[PDB]
Design a protein around this ligand. Structure first.
Ligand code: RH
Ligand code: RH
Length: 124
């Protein structure tokens, strides 16, 4: 019974580094955040902004979600993010990733009271 809010924080928040710590980052973080337990999760994004600044996106630019729901929101400012991408030679349980740093607008899906991020949809 992890809450949806807490699952988003575990899968997508890393405020403790300004940018993709190092070439090792995604290998470490995909494992430590438990995204390689049942299979290698093929792609995942981490956001290097404060929790308050990511939560605030739920009152910013309303945009269509990829799944056609209406509860997605685009950040008005660019954010520091790390994209993690499974290498073609990565074989479970030894999940290997390329670490790439970018500064992009994020899109998140928000639900509940309080209204908070529960899903990372895209960066643009
Ligand atoms: Rh999701
Ligand atoms: Rh999900």
């Amino acid at each position: 019974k992890e809450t949806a809010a807490a699952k988003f924080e575990r899968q997508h928040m890393d405020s403790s580094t300004s940018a993709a710590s190092s070439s090792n980052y995604c290998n470490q973080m995909m494992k430590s955040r438990n995204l390689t337990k049942d299979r290698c999760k093929p792609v995942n994004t981490f956001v290097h902004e404060s929790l308050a600044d990511v939560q605030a996106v739920c009152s910013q630019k309303n945009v269509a979600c990829k799944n056609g729901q209406t509860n997605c929101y685009q950040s008005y400012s660019t954010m520091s993010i790390t994209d993690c991408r499974e290498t073609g030679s990565s074989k479970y349980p030894n999940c290997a990733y390329k670490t790439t740093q970018a500064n992009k607008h994020i899109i998140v899906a928000c639900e509940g009271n309080p209204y908070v991020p529960v899903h990372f949809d895209a960066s643009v």
